[PDB]
Design a protein around this ligand. Structure first.
Ligand SMILES: CCCCCCCCCCCCCCCC(=O)O
Lengths: 268, 57, 256, 238, 238, 57, 125
């Protein structure tokens, strides 16, 4: 519950609440009553939406990819990264270190693609999603042994019902996920430099289990991320810049703020 | 083993929750954790400073 | 009686005494401490050089000019070749340590200037070229200060840190550096700034050469300015002392 | 088979929903937690920390570090206005990019007092008195020092402590004021004046600078969290 | 009919899911259990058992039983290096096919100490001293005996007991090291040197052999189980 | 007859399970059976050997 | 049971194991120990590198020939450039330490030879 103001009355005193030192770096903490006479007001306001969990407990689409029932590109592969979507990336960047369980919802939509073939008949498409840990063999073709998934987690979805949903335990070699790493992959210091060095979350593969009809069908799979049981430390300033790559923090230089006509003027 | 907790309501009413999984990572988020402490970020300095005393003396 | 401004800090065989100082800042309210057995991943006993490693070390001074964008130091690199502490890390695979920072600037009453002394965990600088990561030589300066540039790095196709002052190299607003622990040195009110840092890192111990934990940055929000015939050279000196330093993984010297 | 009915909205996807779903991996052993400094439990605590204000955000000044600095100089006549900015932190250009303003761009409603901190950055010899004032809504912005004095104000003196705090009381008919600018709720006008002329000895500079810091007070609160306006992507980044 | 809502993901198939489903045959009488030797409850117990190491895995040697044997001979100068292999059991060619390595190919993360056992296979008269050393990561692999001695090592003497155990302490910044090779985590370098020259009487062979055995220690553990790389089928077998 | 058991959680929280079938072969797997004993495979030999004594004497 | 001849010495991260050895000799019946406060001339606190300095260091081997007069080593000079211990002494004006000596020679039953291993305080050549 928010703190409630205390009523105050005029006084002349040696004590100087308003006067303080910026140099110490201790933020000044003075109530309105110390600066002016005030009236006793009770506050029922609650700081219950500013909690880190409430702020980060909402689904956002990290990335989407397209695969075809026919033609050369039978299946789609995406490396699992938070950084490629700006909104998800900006809020995660607010804390240097974050620890959190992950909730995953996949939405798949199929669109018929125009074609020369006629009198097409389409049985309901079934879609398979398979997640491979680092060093698991990658599928090279859609008909590969890798698609058996005996040792790999996998979900099968039939079109026309609720999107498939899974819960992920906190996966890290480290005690906490590191939003920023100031380090090199090797001891020498010649090599790639960045958070990409600590990036080993595996890869995700999506394919049509079966083909209903002769005509070409294109399917888009959208991946949604929802933090759960969130724990944060070492808070960082707001990014204040448009992103450029998901592997580095490289930025085009940016003015500090939008500019008003004059220091006196109240118009932006 | 049902658990009974209070609901989010206005000022100036309980919801039953049962866990059906043992993974413990399948539970709902802890939305109702209203605890705050600005002491780390604000007033970081070792020697404590009173509200109305000269800051440097 | 006593004065809030007067202070005396004694570490090892080095003692620091300033007549005027702003109250000392502990960045997260946590004193640096040795690692707990409950939290310790490594089985082998650690070696603690005690006072040898834990002493003040003085770095090369810089000149504050009326138009200096900024000066910045990577702290682990700063002490990488200094005394036993430089030797111990070169010998050992893993090191965790607290850091004491003391920034001293002296000026006449007539002089006017304001410097911001901020230590930032995991600062990652961003290269001027988008397709290239920043070079190690640009990223870290050993035995020498690295300086921010008032203008943005010009168009290029080479490794080069982006040094524009407002972004501070992190591509974030300079004014919001308040959230990071910091201490303001104002020439009229303060002679010097003392910041004490708890060890900060996701892992309990990390190899010092590959990874740097915190970066000390100095920027003048208000330019230095003086009337003619006043001392025209102003010196800023950074002194750093390791706290509760410990080492593990005894290994042959050098990094590759 | 117990008889069951299906509610309207069965098999639908809501972004903000809280439910129980089966883990991808059964019985995973999570890595043990370790102590980390500066643990964060609330966004408001970050907003309480002071943030430097780019008060002089005109033209080239935002491109230089001169945005934050506010110019002051010795002047022939007392009563000249040092600066004027809109009270609201969220919409105004001056407070939009600050720590508190950035957090506010995320939330639709905002409540409570704002603390403004002003630190003189001139020589020891330099002395001066300034009048910092807040004027309640529905009154045209003050055009003279006499008008400004009617609005609640703090008279500040340079020397001794070198910083001052003007605390703006919340004075709103509504419990919550929209972060987005609203015709219905106008936050107020904040302006500064010379209580007295700045005085300096010979060999000391006539002109000095004043930095401004803005933060959330203990009574401050937010609601209706929303997507922020500033961050946008044309395409997914690589 | 009680009102019910349907959760997202209803009617979906997850490989790793644990639920209750109706038996194909009701009330089947299962055959009674009987006592069987060597009952297994954990995979780790199998990894604790020592496995012969094909240390000399070069060219024709893997095709013969010579892979396992490590060559040693009397030499004019002390300090020559008997052999060198990478510390990690999972990725390295030398440990990939062993009992512990094969179990590791199944799991993504691995933790804890490794015990290496060395048995001299020469004549009774033959005598010798060897230095077995482990060097911590981030240091170039030792190129001389003096460099190797800096890394933790055990000096072994032939005669009396004919086998020695060098136990490699876990020395990792991370709690878990990836089985797949990782730039971030480097396990270490393991190398052997002649502490002294091998000495033999006339009518005894100058050159002998040394076998190496690799096993999981009590502290060892695994996580994130994954499909193994080695086993593949072009088509279903008949 | 509901059964209450502990969940799988980290270190340094209960799930209810009810059987709706009588076949007993329709139950969930016993994932939480963390018991191990290497004594069979390792230290197979009849006469016990101490950690630090000559192996053959 | 146990054997008088078998021995195992563990110092720091270095372990020495010899199947056959003569009983270990303590030269004056005194174990090496840190200096007493009662006996300490210097006011300043001493620095003890502990396991770093206290580990076995192996020197360059020599060849025993049928006509080798003798081999001799100045021990403080021997470890003067070896590991942290060589570094600490170079850094510090005063050092006091105990020393463990282990001399290893291996030969066939048929071989015959006798070597005298003696440590002498203050030998002046
Ligand atoms: C079975 C299909 C789903 C597979 C999900 C695999 C696990 C993905 C975990 C991603 C966690 C991302 C954490 C933040 C970014 C980072 O630290 O890398």
């Amino acid at each position: 519950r928010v703190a409630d103001t205390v009523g105050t009355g005029p006084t002349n005193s040696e004590a100087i609440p308003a006067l303080t030192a910026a140099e110490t770096g201790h933020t000044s903490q003075v109530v309105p009553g110390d600066t002016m006479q005030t009236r006793h007001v009770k506050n029922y306001h609650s700081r219950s939406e500013s909690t880190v969990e409430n702020f980060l407990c909402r689904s956002a689409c990290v990335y989407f990819t397209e695969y075809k029932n026919s033609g050369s590109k039978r299946y789609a592969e995406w490396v699992v990264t938070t950084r490629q979507a700006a909104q998800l990336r900006r809020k995660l960047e607010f804390f240097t270190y974050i620890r959190f369980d992950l909730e995953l919802t996949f939405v798949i939509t199929s669109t018929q693609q125009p074609s020369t073939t006629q009198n097409q008949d389409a049985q309901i498409l079934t879609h398979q999603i398979m997640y491979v840990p680092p060093g698991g063999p990658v599928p090279d073709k859609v008909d590969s042994y890798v698609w058996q998934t005996s040792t790999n987690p996998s979900v099968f979805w039939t079109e026309g019902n609720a999107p498939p949903r899974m819960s992920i335990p906190f996966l890290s070699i480290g005690n906490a996920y590191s939003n920023f790493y100031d380090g090199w992959s090797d001891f020498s210091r010649d090599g790639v430099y960045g958070i990409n060095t600590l990036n080993s979350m595996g890869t995700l593969y999506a394919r049509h289990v079966n083909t209903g009809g002769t005509g070409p069908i294109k399917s888009t799979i959208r991946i949604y991320f929802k933090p759960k049981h969130v724990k944060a430390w070492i808070p960082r300033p707001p990014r204040l810049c448009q992103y450029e790559k998901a592997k580095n923090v490289n930025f085009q230089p940016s003015g500090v703020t939008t500019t008003r006509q004059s220091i006196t003027a109240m118009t932006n | 083993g049902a658990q009974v907790s209070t609901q989010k309501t206005g000022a100036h009413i309980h919801y039953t929750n049962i866990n059906y999984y043992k993974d413990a990572a399948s539970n709902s988020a802890t939305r109702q954790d209203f605890a705050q402490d600005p002491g780390k970020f604000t007033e970081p300095v070792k020697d404590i400073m009173i509200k109305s005393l000269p800051a440097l003396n | 009686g006593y004065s809030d401004r007067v202070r005396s800090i004694t570490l090892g065989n080095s003692t620091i005494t300033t007549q005027e100082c702003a109250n000392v800042v502990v960045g997260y309210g946590v004193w640096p401490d040795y690692l707990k057995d409950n939290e310790a991943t490594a089985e082998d006993q650690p070696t603690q050089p005690d006072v040898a490693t834990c002493r003040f070390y003085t770095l090369d001074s810089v000149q504050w000019q009326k138009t200096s964008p900024g000066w910045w130091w990577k702290l682990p690199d700063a002490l990488s070749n200094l005394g036993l502490f430089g030797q111990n890390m070169q010998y050992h695979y893993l090191g965790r340590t607290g850091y004491t920072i003391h920034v001293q600037c002296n000026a006449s009453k007539f002089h006017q200037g304001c410097l911001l002394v901020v230590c930032v965990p995991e600062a990652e600088m961003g290269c001027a070229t988008l397709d290239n990561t920043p070079s190690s030589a640009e990223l870290l300066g050993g035995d020498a200060a690295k300086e921010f540039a008032g203008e943005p790095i010009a168009s290029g196709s080479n490794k080069l840190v982006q040094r524009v002052v407002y972004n501070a190299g992190m591509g974030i607003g300079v004014g919001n550096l308040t959230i990071f622990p910091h201490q303001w040195i104002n020439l009229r009110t303060n002679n010097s700034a003392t910041i004490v840092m708890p060890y900060t890192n996701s892992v309990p111990m990390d190899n010092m050469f590959r990874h740097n934990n915190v970066t000390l940055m100095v920027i003048p929000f208000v330019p230095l300015d003086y009337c003619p015939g006043s001392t025209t050279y102003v010196p800023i000196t950074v002194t750093i002392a390791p706290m509760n330093a410990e080492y593990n993984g005894l290994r042959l010297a050098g990094h590759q | 088979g117990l008889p069951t009915m299906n509610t309207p909205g069965s098999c639908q996807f809501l972004t903000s929903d809280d439910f129980q779903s089966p883990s991808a991996m059964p019985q995973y052993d999570v890595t043990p937690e370790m102590r980390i400094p500066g643990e964060v439990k609330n966004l408001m605590e970050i907003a309480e920390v002071d943030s430097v204000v780019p008060v002089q955000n005109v033209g080239e000044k935002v491109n230089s570090m001169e945005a934050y600095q506010i110019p002051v100089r010795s002047n022939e006549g007392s009563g000249t206005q040092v600066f004027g900015f809109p009270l609201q932190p969220g919409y105004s250009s001056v407070f939009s990019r600050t720590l508190l303003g950035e957090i506010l761009n995320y939330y639709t409603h905002w409540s409570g007092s704002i603390k403004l901190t002003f630190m003189f950055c001139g020589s020891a010899m330099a002395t001066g008195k300034f009048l910092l004032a807040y004027s309640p809504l529905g009154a045209g912005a003050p055009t003279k020092r006499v008008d400004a004095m009617l609005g609640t104000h703090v008279v500040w003196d340079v020397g001794l402590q070198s910083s001052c705090v003007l605390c703006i009381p919340w004075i709103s008919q509504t419990h919550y004021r929209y972060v987005a600018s609203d015709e219905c709720t106008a936050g107020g006008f904040i302006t500064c004046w010379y209580q007295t002329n700045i005085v300096v000895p010979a060999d000391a500079q006539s002109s000095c600078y004043i930095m401004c810091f803005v933060s959330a007070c203990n009574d401050f609160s937010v609601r209706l969290l929303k997507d922020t306006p500033f961050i946008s992507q044309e395409n997914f980044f690589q």
